[PDB]
Structures are given as structure tokens and as C-alpha cells.
Amino acid sequence: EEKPKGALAVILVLTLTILVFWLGVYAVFFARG
């Protein structure tokens, strides 16, 4: 609880969103090469 757990979740979602968009476009990239 007292641990930044709430904040950790936030930067986790953030990290996942960055990962999806990124690798995702990276895929589209090679699919267009």
C-alpha cells in the first residue's frame, strides 16, 4: 500500500502503451520495406 504502488501502476500502463505503439509501428515499418 504505502509503496508508490498506485504510481507504479501508472508508469506501467505508460510503459506498455509506449511498447505497443513502438514495436507496433516498427512492425508496420518492416511490412512496408
Partner: protein, 544 residues
């Protein structure tokens, strides 16, 4: 006693008025990306509008350039003044407001007269009317007065407090303004050396590549110029509005210091698709761009921790219980928070664009706009709308009714929802290669493949028109209606033993400034020296 309030209010109102006018074109643009041509209608309402593009120029200039700058001049001058309880030099402050107002009026004329349909980036050879460039230049030079005014405030406070660390909000404002000064040089150089003498008829041509290079020198940091006023409020005031405290003074300072150091030397990331610019330099700017993303990643945590702390403090239940515990009853609190949520997908989109080669997938497609509306049109604009429910009461004395409270609260959710919906329609249409800055509804069978994302765009178009309308209502409502003596909602800060050391290191503003300038010279100097050594001006055109 507090003459800074009037001036601040004038910057704010003028900014919101620019927001209203500029955004009028927004809905029609969303419908346009929804393949629905509503411009014949728009023209019946606004007979001066000659085209989709004139409408778009007004949209970008009034929202992304005028409204944002005015909001920053208001916030980044008034908050430090209040924190220091010192009066800004009012002669300069009013002079700065008049330059903005006059520059604005002078640029408006040509724009509204269809004499400068070149978009907010105004890339040569597209050649606009001299009053457009002249007015834009004066509008922007207005910030140089604001810079002097804040450094003057800081200077005066230091003198009276030798050996003391610069207060938080003022530390943010000083590095912010020093950063903007360094950032503005690219555009000021583009205007003074080419655009002005060109539109005035003293020269026949301008080199397109050096023009875009000087433009983007300012082009990237200007969005940080747009963002930071919102970050100042999210770090120093929202924690209190949230019912908690700013968990860390030092980290807030660090975020702002990294912005001073990294906002300017990354411009080539808007030129990945440009010829004549070395690929190595593009990679360097790409790396530096990923670095400037760090301050925001850090901000993501410091702010979230502050909201979590405030949640758990007021009944915060479980792992996500602190969320529902927040003041979702106050629009002042809701606006910025919803904005931060959307800022998440917004940021990922940004890290993608900064990845050099990956940019070729999305460059110039409907994707860029989808991405940036989550940034400036959402996080920034929502934070500004939210200030209506606290900064205005502070500046006028007039409170917010339970009614006005419920309205603005409706305005904010619908605005945030409209942007999320639109972000879906634009990123998608962009992945489907639909071009940005295009009147596709005029070429109905041009993009069949994007029929579904277009539905989102039409939907978003409807939702946002409602939001805008409720907003215009709520705004004039809160001003013409009939706490002022209460200070600004500056939050309390949780200090630690480590703070002092870090803080004193970051307080060496003069040194960090030189480092920031050195970085800019190292990142742009080689390229610009090669450019000015092989200039090739070309003639202007008026293709509208």
C-alpha cells in the same frame, strides 16, 4: 496593490478568445476527416472563409500559436510573482500585452482576408502577406519582454535573499523563460533574415531548406513552451487541489532543468524526411529527442505519486482505490488529470515519431495530428480550461456556482472524450495513409479503406462541437457573473535531507544556461554553417 492581476486576466481572456475563434474550425475539420464536407455550411455562417485551408491556417495560428503563448505569458509570469509576493514591472508587463494584441491584430487582417493561407508553419516558397509575418514577429517578440520581466523578478528576489535557494515556482519560470529565449532565436532569425525582407519585397527568394531548419530550431521547443505552464500548475497547484501535497520539490526542479537543456537541440526530428541534411546528424537529434522525453517520463511518476498520495490520504482504498477517492467533483482537478491520461498515448506516439526511420511510416499523415491533439489540444488546453475554476476566481473575486461547476465539469469530460475519440480516427486514418492538412471530403472516393476510422472522426466532430459550445457558454458565464483575497492554491511540499544538495546544484542557473546554449551550437552549428555557405533562394508562390 496587485496590478498584475488585471494584466494577467487580459492575457488569459485574449488567449481564450483566440481559442474560441480558432476552435470554431475544429469540428468542420473533424467532419472533413470523417469524409463529411460541411464547409458549404461553414461558409454560409462565415462568408469571409474562402477555403478549407484558410480555415485551417486560422485554426493552427489561433490555437497552437496565439492561445498557447498567451496562456504561458499569464501563468509563467503571474505564478512566480505571487509566489515571491513581488510586483512585476507593470510598465513592461502592459507593454508585453500590447505587443501581443497589436501583433495579433496585424496578423489577423491578412489571415481573415485570405492573403496568408500558408498554415501555422508557413513554409517558403508559399508566400504570405507582409502583415502576417510582421504581426507574427511582433506577437512573438512579446515574450522577450516577459522573459526580462521574470528574470528581473528573480534578480530582485536574489538580491534581497543572498545565499538562498530560488523558490520552486520561480525556479521553474526562470529556466522556462531562459529556455524559451534560446528556442525563439531560430524563428526570430528566420523572420528577420528572410521572411520579413522577402514579404516586404526587398528580396525575391528564400532558401526553403534553411527556412525549415531555422523554423524547427524553434518548432520543437515551442511545444515545450506550450507544455511547461501546464506542468507548473500540475506540479505546484494540482497536488493541493487533489487534496495532498507535491511529493518532491527536487524532482520537479530536475524535470524543468532537463527541459532547459534538451528542448532546443532536437529539431531535425521534424526534418527526418528532408533532403540536404546529413543522416548522422539526424540520428544524433533522434537520440537527444529520446532524452528530452525523459523529463516527462519522470514527471509521469512524480505527478502520479502525488495523486496517489492525495488519494490514500482521503480514504484511498486499494491499489486503485486512491483513484476514485480523488475530488472528481472539482472541474479544476478533473481537467488536468483527464489531460494527463490522454497524454499517455500522446507520449508514446511522440517516442515513435522521434525514432528516425519509424517516422517515415507516419510523417505527414493524419497520425501526427491525432498524436498532438492529445498533447496540446488535450493536456495543455484542458489544464487551461481547468484554470477557469480557480485562477479566474482568484483574479476576479467571483466564485464558481454549483451550476457553473457542473457545466465546466461537463465541458471537460466531453472535451476529453472528443479528443480520445478523434485520436482513434486520426491515428488509424494515418496508418491507412490518409494525408494530414488535406480537404479529403472534397475527394469523397479518395480513401475508401478508411471508412471506419472516418466514423470516429465524424463522431468526434459532433462531440467536440458540443464541448466547444458548452465551453464558450461556461466561459462568458464565469466572467459576466456576479476567494479573491485568498492566495493561490500553491501546494505544500514534502522535503528530505537530500533535497538541499540537489537543489543547490540545479540552482546554478547561469551555468546550466551556458550548457544549454553550448548544446544548441553543437547540434545546429555544423549544419547551419554548411547551409549558409550554399544558399539557394527560390521565388515565392500564392497557390490559393
Amino acid at each position: 496593490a496587485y496590478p498584475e492581476k488585471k494584466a494577467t486576466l487580459y492575457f488569459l481572456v485574449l488567449g481564450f478568445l483566440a481559442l474560441i475563434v480558432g476552435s470554431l474550425f475544429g469540428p468542420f475539420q473533424a467532419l472533413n476527416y470523417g469524409n463529411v464536407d460541411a464547409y458549404p455550411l461553414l461558409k454560409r455562417l462565415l462568408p469571409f472563409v474562402q477555403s478549407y485551408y484558410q480555415g485551417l491556417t486560422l485554426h493552427g495560428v489561433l490555437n497552437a500559436i496565439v492561445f498557447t503563448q498567451l496562456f504561458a505569458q499569464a501563468i509563467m509570469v503571474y505564478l512566480p510573482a505571487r509566489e515571491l509576493n513581488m510586483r512585476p514591472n507593470m510598465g513592461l508587463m502592459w507593454l508585453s500585452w500590447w505587443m501581443a494584441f497589436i501583433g495579433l491584430v496585424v496578423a489577423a487582417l491578412p489571415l481573415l482576408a485570405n492573403e496568408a493561407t500558408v498554415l501555422y508553419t508557413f513554409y517558403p516558397p508559399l508566400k504570405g502577406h507582409w502583415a502576417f509575418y510582421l504581426g507574427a514577429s511582433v506577437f512573438v517578440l512579446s515574450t522577450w519582454v516577459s522573459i526580462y520581466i521574470v528574470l528581473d523578478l528573480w534578480r530582485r528576489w536574489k538580491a534581497a535573499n543572498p545565499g538562498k535557494v530560488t523558490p520552486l515556482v520561480t525556479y521553474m519560470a526562470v529556466v522556462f523563460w531562459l529556455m524559451w529565449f534560446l528556442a525563439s532565436l531560430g524563428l526570430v532569425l528566420e523572420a528577420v533574415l528572410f521572411l520579413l525582407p522577402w514579404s516586404f519585397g526587398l528580396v525575391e527568394g528564400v532558401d526553403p531548406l534553411v527556412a525549415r531548419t531555422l523554423f524547427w530550431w524553434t518548432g520543437h521547443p515551442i511545444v515545450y513552451f506550450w507544455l511547461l505552464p501546464a506542468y507548473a500548475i500540475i506540479y505546484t497547484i494540482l497536488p493541493k487541489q487533489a487534496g495532498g501535497k507535491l511529493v518532491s520539490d527536487p524532482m520537479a526542479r530536475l524535470a524543468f532543468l532537463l527541459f532547459l537543456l534538451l528542448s532546443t537541440p532536437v529539431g531535425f526530428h521534424h526534418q527526418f524526411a528532408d533532403p540536404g541534411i546529413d543522416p548522422t546528424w539526424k540520428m544524433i537529434h533522434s537520440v537527444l529527442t529520446l532524452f528530452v522525453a525523459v523529463p516527462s517520463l519522470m514527471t509521469a511518476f512524480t505527478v502520479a505519486a502525488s495523486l496517489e498520495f492525495a488519494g490514500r490520504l482521503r480514504g484511498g482504498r486499494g491499489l486503485f482505490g486512491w483513484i476514485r477517492a480523488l475530488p472528481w467533483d472539482n472541474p479544476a482537478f478533473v481537467a488536468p488529470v483527464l489531460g494527463l491520461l490522454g497524454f499517455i498515448p500522446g507520449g508514446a506516439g511522440g517516442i515513435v515519431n522521434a525514432s528516425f526511420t519509424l517516422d517515415y511510416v507516419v510523417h505527414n499523415t493524419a497520425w501526427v495530428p491525432g498524436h498532438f491533439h492529445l498533447q496540446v489540444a488535450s493536456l495543455v488546453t484542458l489544464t487551461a480550461m481547468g484554470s477557469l475554476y480557480w485562477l479566474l476566481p482568484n483574479l476576479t473575486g467571483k466564485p464558481i456556482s454549483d451550476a457553473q461547476r457542473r457545466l465546466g465539469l461537463a465541458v471537460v469530460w466531453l472535451w476529453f472524450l472528443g479528443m480520445m475519440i478523434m485520436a482513434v480516427g486520426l491515428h488509424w486514418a494515418g496508418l491507412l495513409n490518409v494525408p494530414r492538412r488535406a480537404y479529403i471530403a472534397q475527394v469523397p472516393d479518395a480513401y475508401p479503406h478508411a471508412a471506419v476510422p472516418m466514423v470516429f472522426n465524424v463522431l468526434a466532430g459532433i462531440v467536440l462541437l458540443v464541448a466547444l459550445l458548452l465551453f464558450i457558454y461556461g466561459l462568458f458565464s464565469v466572467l459576466l457573473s456576479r476567494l479573491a483575497e485568498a492566495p493561490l492554491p500553491f501546494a505544500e511540499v514534502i522535503s528530505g535531507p537530500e533535497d538541499r544538495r540537489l537543489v543547490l546544484a540545479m540552482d546554478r542557473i547561469g551555468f546550466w544556461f551556458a550548457v544549454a546554449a553550448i548544446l544548441v551550437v553543437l547540434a545546429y552549428g555544423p549544419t547551419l554553417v554548411q547551409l549558409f555557405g550554399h544558399l539557394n533562394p527560390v521565388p515565392g508562390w500564392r497557390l490559393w
